[PDB]
């Protein structure tokens, strides 16, 4: 773990925007 | 020491030569005159090691002016190094050639400069442009004879966009010192080419690219609109200098822009976020941002109409930053944020900075004078400051009250009683003269004006010239208004200022007052106690000619100093 | 209990100013926490740390009660710490020494000699107006003691009380009677100092103190004869402080009497030739003897010897010796003024000396040596010195030149020319207070006005940034507009004054940014007076006055409004109040 | 008498301070700063005599730490220098090879010696051995 | 257009200087120290000095003043930017900013200074580019500087493509003594530590209010940043055209975007301060802190600094949650809290005496500031949509990012 | 250093 918010996975783009 | 260093330098050992060079560099950095060893290091100059070559070049540059005669044994080495296959070596040689302040050294370096002008390496091209600019600065005639202007101009329309920006900066610097004859101005195709390479230029090259547009004057709305559209993306750059240059370019272009067109409105809307971002820069750049905002405030004051919260001086803000914030708030003060300004002034009046307190008091007084809707609020704030029991605060409040009385004394009769007994024992000439003038002009709501003036008449003959004149004027006004209780006071004042007063102006004023009193006391009311016209306050806005000139000169030393560029350079 | 040495080492270990301030704040917080508990064991270390912090520039307001508590303690170290705190952080304006009066009174009768001496020294160093009133009786009681180590302390306390309270010297007249036979050098020096202080405070004791002149002469002769002594013999001079005190008493004793000077004439003559000025002590003794001879009604031979000694010391290359010689010459300016004229070359050379103090002394000597015959000759030297003087001496040189011109000016025309040259060259170095004096001098002189008016007009159109010169020119124009321009009512031949350049210059000065509100007022007054003084430029100044009536300054706006009202409603009465001001000394 | 006597180092650090005239703390600090600036901005051929504020500002430092005196214009200048030399010799005798480091550590001892030597700006101990003996006796008390 | 840039010291000694134009003599640096001393003693000291016709602009560094003397009316902003770039390069190359490294790396320092700028015009400013050509422990200049892409070095190879993002939030609240917040602005910080193979071009996508409105999705929680500053690698053309955040990520930690907008929400921590200070008798500290943040968010390492009296001594603390320590150097008591869950209410009761002697001069009323830092909290509500990582070779990236909320200019005006 | 040196060197 790490202080200041755990790292989270990010997407590649907005899949709902086509 | 010196002998051992010379012996080590005159040896054939590379490690010993490197150690001697390092010792000489350390001595020079520590403050040791190593110029006497420059001729010894001249022989140990052509070395294969790049580290030793850089140190030798630095020593020659630092020992070139000191020993110009000994610098004549380096032209061959510079010529040999100018053709080095390594681009770093060629760039270092080009930089050293232009950094040598030798009149006879640059003459023999014209051929290497011409050879390196067409260097294919972008770093080599930038070094050649820098060397050409340095030679032109040192010898404009030599640069003109070498014909480097054509090469510099053609460098802009080439590849190596950082090299193009370096060449453009060099050409601008040459033209900056030029007398404006044969300028390097370009047509709209040149501006478009620079804008195309603006997005590919580096942070340093962006400033150079934007500097060229600052001199070009747009002539068409379409060209101005295109320039504004191109410079709009520059406002989203992390570089503070690049953002400032873009803002200056936009302000310059707005001079020919049409207010009817929506381009001006869009530029004004997009400029506020840029100003807010710049206001939160580093403390060193905070003063520059404040100066730029003040310079552009007089041009487009409606751009930052709603920018008032950011103008507040932070607790940890520097004294210069606090002063700039106070000046911005005073220039941006409005009736909409009048309450916020008054609250900030009251909060700013509780600080421990005497200069800061005086500046806050002056800003509050200026805001009260400029906006008559807050005259009551300003009077209440001044009364609270006086009641705070602060000597400097009391003096500032007295000065503000005196200024307001001369500006808006129609409804200032409600503070005479409060100011009548307000710890008048202060001997400050600025506050004492203001109080005396207020008492003399407002000697109607105070029934003890003669008694109050009696205490100030003990040392009238030795108080001050301005203080004595103010006291005499107040006594004359009291005698003209109510001479029953001041008949003897007027005579005493005339005797003190006429016989015991050796001041020329004060003596003349006393004689004139005595003559007026002895000629027609009734006429003195219409002559001395006359209704003065409206006081013409000094406008803080700069002249329109200076404002237009200051718009082009954005980010320079003149903007911070608020002086013309020709009035600050030596 | 942090020791003072540990605090000093910690302070020396700190490099940053902020770090040093933080360490000092932590130490002060620790000291305050220790004091708040009424700690008395490690009070000495806390007191030493607080004294070091106060000397370093740290606040010590909270450390005031601790010193008072330690003063009333019993430990010798604690008593010394309290005395040091009272002497350092305790003063008359502090107001915390009022409670220390009881402690001093209790310690005044203490049997211990170190405690009593420390208390006396603290009282002398921190003498107050009210402390001496309640402690005057105690000081006089100890003045009659036979303790040699305490006689000097009692004399110092009495002298401090007399200096702080001159009305309390009446109680010390019989205490010091019959005290010229003290064998100890310190006791005799203290008695001599007390007698000198009593004589200087009031002249009533001069006659009573003048009877002991033979005793002082005998003591000085005995000290001179006993030139060898392990104690007080430094650099070959035995009891140099005692000799200096004796010389000062002789100079101040019988300064206006012949009997006192005659009695000490032999002693002064012996000292002037039996003393060697090779060392600093000998030079100081010789200078003191010369000063005493000059300040007293000494013989012609004594004055000649003093003049020769001063001349010899003037040629000395030592900076201190040169400064002492210059000070002696300045002091002996009125006395032996004719003999001081032989050092005119030395005085002139001292102005170019590379010593600021030496240059100032030479300038002062030159200013004091200016007479009614060398004033004209010295005027060129003074002007050259002012032109090529230091920035701190240019104003002083200009003031001295103006004073010499006003006091011993050879002629009004020459004095006027010198004043004009000083104003033109002084620029911003001319004092503003000297402007009223120059105006009064110009008003008093009524014979040279056309040339002076022309010179002022010429110097005003060239430059206007000089506040004193500008004010003087404006005053001269206002006083003699009728004489500066002759026949300027209408168009005439091209002359220096055309009746229009003066108005333009006045308007430029009034509207110029180089106005301090004093020169602007003088210019406005001159313009108003020129309405009746000058009849050529009329109907034009009224518009300027009306426009100038709305000035930002309250006084300037009121003056402009009054001028406009007078021009618009009292045109016929303008000349009724434009009479020339009276001229008085 | 001596209005104020202060010992200051060459770098500006003050090692001693003894003022016989009651002045405000801010005023005293300003006066000390001005005196340090004048001494720090003075050459070696200035005669060691300065007439600042009508006071005989005599500066004469025999080492890195310098000393200053402020006396009225009523006595000879050589007397102040002689007194300063005598005080320096007495301090050296009392301590022994006095250095800058020892002065900071011996601030209390130096202050006590100065108080026992001169009180109120006037000379109190003309002799050199009697004052040393008295100082030693006072120190031995505890 | 500074004539010469030099590095000074705390004692006025110049650690290192390098003339660029030669129009300003090196002896003018000596007069800079007396001018600075006079300005500080009179309050007229400014970073941009002026020695006659030559201006000596100086910046206060960690141990020395970065004095950059200039002669003509050069670009002050450009000089400041060059000084900041030089400071950043020195910090990257040397971890310590003091006299220890100034005289220890002079051989490489001189080369770096020479390569950085020539004739007063900076040329090299990339830390990685400078380290690839100038080292303290030489080949031809890299083609990255000559090429257009000077912020993404080509040819980088890594075993794994992992990028660590950091959603840094700065909560600045300016609460006046009357209890009303005057300046309440939150400045975003999108810093990503990209460590992959090659030179991928990041395609930034987030829940931006402007982007949502343009795409027609302006109905959900969208972050409306008043001021958004892109990084050097970020292309301004795409952002101006359609808000497309397309740029080459840097090799390492870099700041891509930094949001900056005003905050109209209640403060995360509500602090009520009571000053029951007696007249030279005692002092009362009625400090009550209320957590306005969500209960699911905990403020880690919260340090609410309460300025205590300058001369106060013997203080007693009566608190409920969180240890209170009085630092004599800071002259204040900081309400240090290890973990502060949202909605927590901490009450403190300070009690200390005061000296009998009153202070000679006033000390002022410094504002009370807290050092709360609650991570994993998104107060602004801006959610990142996706990060378009595209490489010519083709690889699967696994970017990571963490949202951190801290207290910035959260100062509360004292009573 | 220069501080350990004797004030009078005696």
Short mmCIF file of N, CA and C in Angstrom, two decimals, chain C residues 149-275:
data_model
loop_
_atom_site.label_atom_id
_atom_site.label_comp_id
_atom_site.label_asym_id
_atom_site.label_seq_id
_atom_site.Cartn_x
_atom_site.Cartn_y
_atom_site.Cartn_z
N UNK C 149 39.58 50.85 49.23
CA UNK C 149 38.88 50.15 48.17
C UNK C 149 37.44 50.61 48.01
N UNK C 150 36.86 51.21 49.04
CA UNK C 150 35.49 51.71 48.98
C UNK C 150 35.41 53.22 48.83
N UNK C 151 36.50 53.94 49.09
CA UNK C 151 36.49 55.39 48.91
C UNK C 151 36.25 55.77 47.46
N UNK C 152 36.89 55.06 46.53
CA UNK C 152 36.68 55.34 45.11
C UNK C 152 35.24 55.05 44.71
N UNK C 153 34.67 53.95 45.21
CA UNK C 153 33.28 53.63 44.89
C UNK C 153 32.32 54.68 45.45
N UNK C 154 32.58 55.14 46.68
CA UNK C 154 31.74 56.19 47.26
C UNK C 154 31.85 57.49 46.48
N UNK C 155 33.06 57.85 46.05
CA UNK C 155 33.24 59.05 45.25
C UNK C 155 32.52 58.93 43.91
N UNK C 156 32.60 57.76 43.28
CA UNK C 156 31.90 57.55 42.01
C UNK C 156 30.39 57.63 42.19
N UNK C 157 29.87 57.05 43.28
CA UNK C 157 28.44 57.13 43.55
C UNK C 157 28.01 58.57 43.79
N UNK C 158 28.81 59.33 44.54
CA UNK C 158 28.48 60.74 44.78
C UNK C 158 28.51 61.54 43.48
N UNK C 159 29.50 61.27 42.62
CA UNK C 159 29.58 61.97 41.34
C UNK C 159 28.38 61.64 40.47
N UNK C 160 27.98 60.36 40.44
CA UNK C 160 26.82 59.96 39.66
C UNK C 160 25.55 60.62 40.19
N UNK C 161 25.41 60.69 41.52
CA UNK C 161 24.24 61.34 42.11
C UNK C 161 24.22 62.82 41.76
N UNK C 162 25.38 63.48 41.82
CA UNK C 162 25.45 64.90 41.48
C UNK C 162 25.10 65.12 40.02
N UNK C 163 25.62 64.27 39.13
CA UNK C 163 25.31 64.40 37.71
C UNK C 163 23.82 64.18 37.44
N UNK C 164 23.23 63.16 38.07
CA UNK C 164 21.81 62.91 37.88
C UNK C 164 20.96 63.92 38.64
N UNK C 165 21.39 64.31 39.83
CA UNK C 165 20.66 65.28 40.65
C UNK C 165 21.60 66.42 41.03
N UNK C 166 21.68 67.48 40.22
CA UNK C 166 22.57 68.60 40.58
C UNK C 166 22.20 69.29 41.87
N UNK C 167 20.95 69.19 42.31
CA UNK C 167 20.53 69.82 43.56
C UNK C 167 20.99 69.06 44.80
N UNK C 168 21.51 67.85 44.63
CA UNK C 168 21.98 67.05 45.75
C UNK C 168 23.47 67.24 46.04
N UNK C 169 24.15 68.10 45.27
CA UNK C 169 25.56 68.35 45.50
C UNK C 169 25.82 69.16 46.77
N UNK C 170 24.78 69.81 47.32
CA UNK C 170 24.97 70.60 48.53
C UNK C 170 25.29 69.73 49.73
N UNK C 171 24.87 68.47 49.72
CA UNK C 171 25.13 67.56 50.83
C UNK C 171 26.51 66.93 50.77
N UNK C 172 27.25 67.12 49.69
CA UNK C 172 28.59 66.57 49.55
C UNK C 172 29.69 67.60 49.79
N UNK C 173 29.34 68.86 50.05
CA UNK C 173 30.36 69.88 50.30
C UNK C 173 31.21 69.57 51.52
N UNK C 174 30.64 69.20 52.68
CA UNK C 174 31.48 68.89 53.84
C UNK C 174 31.99 67.46 53.88
N UNK C 175 31.46 66.57 53.04
CA UNK C 175 31.91 65.18 53.04
C UNK C 175 33.30 65.03 52.45
N UNK C 176 33.64 65.82 51.43
CA UNK C 176 34.93 65.75 50.77
C UNK C 176 35.96 66.70 51.36
N UNK C 177 35.61 67.44 52.42
CA UNK C 177 36.56 68.35 53.03
C UNK C 177 37.68 67.58 53.72
N UNK C 178 38.91 68.06 53.55
CA UNK C 178 40.09 67.44 54.14
C UNK C 178 40.28 66.00 53.64
N UNK C 179 40.42 65.88 52.32
CA UNK C 179 40.60 64.58 51.68
C UNK C 179 41.69 64.62 50.62
N UNK C 180 42.61 65.57 50.72
CA UNK C 180 43.71 65.71 49.77
C UNK C 180 44.98 65.00 50.21
N UNK C 181 44.94 64.30 51.35
CA UNK C 181 46.10 63.59 51.88
C UNK C 181 45.97 62.08 51.75
N UNK C 182 45.14 61.60 50.83
CA UNK C 182 44.95 60.17 50.66
C UNK C 182 46.18 59.56 50.00
N UNK C 183 46.74 58.52 50.63
CA UNK C 183 47.93 57.87 50.09
C UNK C 183 47.59 57.04 48.86
N UNK C 184 46.43 56.38 48.87
CA UNK C 184 46.05 55.54 47.74
C UNK C 184 45.79 56.39 46.50
N UNK C 185 46.29 55.92 45.36
CA UNK C 185 46.09 56.64 44.11
C UNK C 185 44.62 56.67 43.72
N UNK C 186 43.90 55.56 43.93
CA UNK C 186 42.49 55.53 43.58
C UNK C 186 41.65 56.48 44.41
N UNK C 187 41.90 56.54 45.72
CA UNK C 187 41.14 57.44 46.58
C UNK C 187 41.41 58.90 46.21
N UNK C 188 42.68 59.24 45.97
CA UNK C 188 43.01 60.60 45.57
C UNK C 188 42.38 60.96 44.23
N UNK C 189 42.41 60.03 43.28
CA UNK C 189 41.79 60.28 41.98
C UNK C 189 40.29 60.48 42.12
N UNK C 190 39.63 59.66 42.95
CA UNK C 190 38.20 59.81 43.17
C UNK C 190 37.88 61.16 43.81
N UNK C 191 38.68 61.57 44.80
CA UNK C 191 38.46 62.86 45.44
C UNK C 191 38.65 64.01 44.45
N UNK C 192 39.68 63.92 43.60
CA UNK C 192 39.91 64.96 42.61
C UNK C 192 38.76 65.02 41.61
N UNK C 193 38.27 63.85 41.18
CA UNK C 193 37.15 63.81 40.24
C UNK C 193 35.90 64.41 40.88
N UNK C 194 35.64 64.08 42.14
CA UNK C 194 34.48 64.64 42.83
C UNK C 194 34.60 66.16 42.97
N UNK C 195 35.79 66.65 43.31
CA UNK C 195 35.99 68.10 43.41
C UNK C 195 35.79 68.78 42.07
N UNK C 196 36.32 68.19 41.00
CA UNK C 196 36.14 68.76 39.67
C UNK C 196 34.67 68.77 39.26
N UNK C 197 33.95 67.69 39.56
CA UNK C 197 32.53 67.63 39.24
C UNK C 197 31.75 68.68 40.02
N UNK C 198 32.07 68.86 41.30
CA UNK C 198 31.41 69.88 42.10
C UNK C 198 31.70 71.28 41.56
N UNK C 199 32.95 71.53 41.17
CA UNK C 199 33.30 72.83 40.61
C UNK C 199 32.59 73.09 39.29
N UNK C 200 32.48 72.06 38.44
CA UNK C 200 31.84 72.24 37.15
C UNK C 200 30.32 72.38 37.27
N UNK C 201 29.72 71.70 38.25
CA UNK C 201 28.27 71.76 38.41
C UNK C 201 27.81 73.17 38.78
N UNK C 202 28.44 73.76 39.79
CA UNK C 202 28.12 75.11 40.23
C UNK C 202 29.42 75.85 40.53
N UNK C 203 29.43 77.17 40.36
CA UNK C 203 30.63 77.96 40.64
C UNK C 203 30.75 78.44 42.08
N UNK C 204 29.79 78.11 42.94
CA UNK C 204 29.86 78.53 44.34
C UNK C 204 31.01 77.86 45.07
N UNK C 205 31.33 76.62 44.73
CA UNK C 205 32.42 75.89 45.36
C UNK C 205 33.78 76.18 44.73
N UNK C 206 33.82 77.01 43.68
CA UNK C 206 35.10 77.34 43.06
C UNK C 206 36.01 78.09 44.02
N UNK C 207 35.46 79.05 44.77
CA UNK C 207 36.25 79.75 45.77
C UNK C 207 36.68 78.82 46.89
N UNK C 208 35.76 77.98 47.37
CA UNK C 208 36.12 77.01 48.41
C UNK C 208 37.10 75.97 47.89
N UNK C 209 36.89 75.50 46.66
CA UNK C 209 37.78 74.51 46.06
C UNK C 209 39.07 75.12 45.53
N UNK C 210 39.15 76.45 45.41
CA UNK C 210 40.36 77.10 44.94
C UNK C 210 41.41 77.25 46.03
N UNK C 211 41.04 77.05 47.30
CA UNK C 211 42.02 77.16 48.38
C UNK C 211 42.98 75.99 48.39
N UNK C 212 42.56 74.84 47.86
CA UNK C 212 43.40 73.64 47.81
C UNK C 212 44.35 73.63 46.61
N UNK C 213 44.50 74.76 45.92
CA UNK C 213 45.42 74.80 44.78
C UNK C 213 46.86 74.50 45.19
N UNK C 214 47.40 75.07 46.27
CA UNK C 214 48.77 74.68 46.67
C UNK C 214 48.91 73.21 46.99
N UNK C 215 47.89 72.59 47.60
CA UNK C 215 47.95 71.16 47.88
C UNK C 215 47.99 70.35 46.59
N UNK C 216 47.18 70.73 45.61
CA UNK C 216 47.19 70.03 44.32
C UNK C 216 48.53 70.21 43.62
N UNK C 217 49.10 71.42 43.69
CA UNK C 217 50.41 71.66 43.07
C UNK C 217 51.48 70.81 43.74
N UNK C 218 51.46 70.73 45.07
CA UNK C 218 52.43 69.90 45.78
C UNK C 218 52.26 68.43 45.43
N UNK C 219 51.01 67.96 45.33
CA UNK C 219 50.77 66.57 44.97
C UNK C 219 51.28 66.28 43.56
N UNK C 220 51.03 67.20 42.62
CA UNK C 220 51.52 67.02 41.26
C UNK C 220 53.05 67.00 41.22
N UNK C 221 53.69 67.89 41.98
CA UNK C 221 55.15 67.91 42.03
C UNK C 221 55.70 66.61 42.61
N UNK C 222 55.07 66.11 43.67
CA UNK C 222 55.52 64.85 44.27
C UNK C 222 55.34 63.69 43.30
N UNK C 223 54.22 63.66 42.57
CA UNK C 223 54.00 62.61 41.58
C UNK C 223 55.02 62.69 40.46
N UNK C 224 55.35 63.90 40.01
CA UNK C 224 56.34 64.07 38.95
C UNK C 224 57.72 63.61 39.44
N UNK C 225 58.07 63.95 40.68
CA UNK C 225 59.35 63.53 41.23
C UNK C 225 59.44 62.01 41.33
N UNK C 226 58.36 61.37 41.78
CA UNK C 226 58.31 59.91 41.89
C UNK C 226 57.91 59.32 40.53
N UNK C 227 58.88 59.33 39.61
CA UNK C 227 58.66 58.83 38.27
C UNK C 227 58.75 57.34 38.09
N UNK C 228 59.09 56.60 39.15
CA UNK C 228 59.20 55.15 39.10
C UNK C 228 58.26 54.54 40.13
N UNK C 229 57.43 53.60 39.69
CA UNK C 229 56.49 52.92 40.58
C UNK C 229 55.94 51.67 39.90
N UNK C 230 55.91 50.53 40.60
CA UNK C 230 55.34 49.32 39.98
C UNK C 230 53.87 49.46 39.62
N UNK C 231 53.12 50.25 40.39
CA UNK C 231 51.70 50.45 40.15
C UNK C 231 51.46 51.84 39.58
N UNK C 232 50.67 51.90 38.51
CA UNK C 232 50.32 53.12 37.78
C UNK C 232 51.42 53.61 36.85
N UNK C 233 52.54 52.90 36.74
CA UNK C 233 53.64 53.29 35.87
C UNK C 233 53.52 52.48 34.58
N UNK C 234 53.02 53.12 33.53
CA UNK C 234 52.83 52.49 32.23
C UNK C 234 53.50 53.36 31.17
N UNK C 235 54.33 52.75 30.33
CA UNK C 235 55.03 53.45 29.25
C UNK C 235 55.93 54.57 29.77
N UNK C 236 56.50 54.38 30.96
CA UNK C 236 57.38 55.36 31.54
C UNK C 236 56.70 56.51 32.25
N UNK C 237 55.37 56.51 32.31
CA UNK C 237 54.61 57.56 32.99
C UNK C 237 53.94 56.94 34.20
N UNK C 238 54.23 57.49 35.38
CA UNK C 238 53.68 56.97 36.63
C UNK C 238 52.43 57.76 36.99
N UNK C 239 51.32 57.05 37.17
CA UNK C 239 50.04 57.67 37.51
C UNK C 239 49.60 58.60 36.38
N UNK C 240 49.57 58.12 35.13
CA UNK C 240 49.10 58.98 34.04
C UNK C 240 47.69 59.50 34.23
N UNK C 241 46.80 58.67 34.78
CA UNK C 241 45.44 59.13 35.07
C UNK C 241 45.45 60.23 36.13
N UNK C 242 46.26 60.07 37.17
CA UNK C 242 46.37 61.10 38.20
C UNK C 242 46.93 62.39 37.62
N UNK C 243 47.95 62.29 36.76
CA UNK C 243 48.51 63.48 36.13
C UNK C 243 47.49 64.17 35.25
N UNK C 244 46.71 63.40 34.49
CA UNK C 244 45.68 63.98 33.63
C UNK C 244 44.61 64.67 34.47
N UNK C 245 44.20 64.05 35.58
CA UNK C 245 43.21 64.66 36.46
C UNK C 245 43.75 65.95 37.07
N UNK C 246 45.01 65.95 37.49
CA UNK C 246 45.62 67.15 38.05
C UNK C 246 45.67 68.27 37.01
N UNK C 247 46.06 67.93 35.78
CA UNK C 247 46.10 68.93 34.72
C UNK C 247 44.71 69.49 34.42
N UNK C 248 43.70 68.62 34.39
CA UNK C 248 42.34 69.08 34.15
C UNK C 248 41.85 69.99 35.27
N UNK C 249 42.16 69.64 36.53
CA UNK C 249 41.77 70.48 37.65
C UNK C 249 42.48 71.83 37.59
N UNK C 250 43.76 71.83 37.23
CA UNK C 250 44.50 73.09 37.11
C UNK C 250 43.93 73.96 36.00
N UNK C 251 43.57 73.35 34.87
CA UNK C 251 42.97 74.11 33.78
C UNK C 251 41.61 74.67 34.18
N UNK C 252 40.80 73.87 34.88
CA UNK C 252 39.48 74.34 35.30
C UNK C 252 39.53 75.15 36.59
N UNK C 253 40.63 75.10 37.33
CA UNK C 253 40.77 75.84 38.58
C UNK C 253 41.49 77.15 38.30
N UNK C 254 40.88 78.25 38.73
CA UNK C 254 41.46 79.56 38.47
C UNK C 254 41.53 79.94 37.01
N UNK C 255 40.53 79.53 36.22
CA UNK C 255 40.52 79.89 34.80
C UNK C 255 40.33 81.38 34.58
N UNK C 256 39.70 82.08 35.53
CA UNK C 256 39.51 83.52 35.44
C UNK C 256 40.13 84.26 36.61
N UNK C 257 41.10 83.65 37.29
CA UNK C 257 41.78 84.27 38.41
C UNK C 257 43.28 84.22 38.18
N UNK C 258 43.98 85.24 38.68
CA UNK C 258 45.42 85.34 38.52
C UNK C 258 46.18 84.57 39.59
N UNK C 259 45.66 84.53 40.82
CA UNK C 259 46.33 83.81 41.89
C UNK C 259 46.40 82.32 41.60
N UNK C 260 45.30 81.73 41.13
CA UNK C 260 45.29 80.30 40.82
C UNK C 260 46.23 79.99 39.66
N UNK C 261 46.21 80.82 38.61
CA UNK C 261 47.11 80.61 37.48
C UNK C 261 48.57 80.80 37.89
N UNK C 262 48.84 81.81 38.72
CA UNK C 262 50.21 82.06 39.16
C UNK C 262 50.74 80.93 40.03
N UNK C 263 49.89 80.38 40.91
CA UNK C 263 50.32 79.30 41.78
C UNK C 263 50.68 78.05 40.98
N UNK C 264 49.88 77.73 39.96
CA UNK C 264 50.13 76.57 39.12
C UNK C 264 51.01 76.87 37.92
N UNK C 265 51.49 78.11 37.78
CA UNK C 265 52.35 78.45 36.66
C UNK C 265 53.66 77.68 36.70
N UNK C 266 54.27 77.57 37.89
CA UNK C 266 55.51 76.83 38.02
C UNK C 266 55.31 75.34 37.73
N UNK C 267 54.21 74.77 38.22
CA UNK C 267 53.92 73.36 37.96
C UNK C 267 53.70 73.12 36.47
N UNK C 268 52.95 74.02 35.82
CA UNK C 268 52.71 73.88 34.39
C UNK C 268 54.01 74.01 33.60
N UNK C 269 54.88 74.94 33.99
CA UNK C 269 56.16 75.09 33.31
C UNK C 269 57.03 73.85 33.49
N UNK C 270 57.06 73.29 34.70
CA UNK C 270 57.85 72.09 34.94
C UNK C 270 57.31 70.91 34.15
N UNK C 271 55.98 70.77 34.08
CA UNK C 271 55.38 69.65 33.36
C UNK C 271 55.61 69.79 31.86
N UNK C 272 55.56 71.01 31.34
CA UNK C 272 55.73 71.23 29.91
C UNK C 272 57.12 70.86 29.42
N UNK C 273 58.12 70.84 30.31
CA UNK C 273 59.48 70.50 29.95
C UNK C 273 60.01 69.23 30.60
N UNK C 274 59.35 68.72 31.64
CA UNK C 274 59.79 67.51 32.33
C UNK C 274 59.01 66.27 31.90
N UNK C 275 58.21 66.38 30.84
CA UNK C 275 57.41 65.27 30.34
C UNK C 275 57.84 64.94 28.92
#
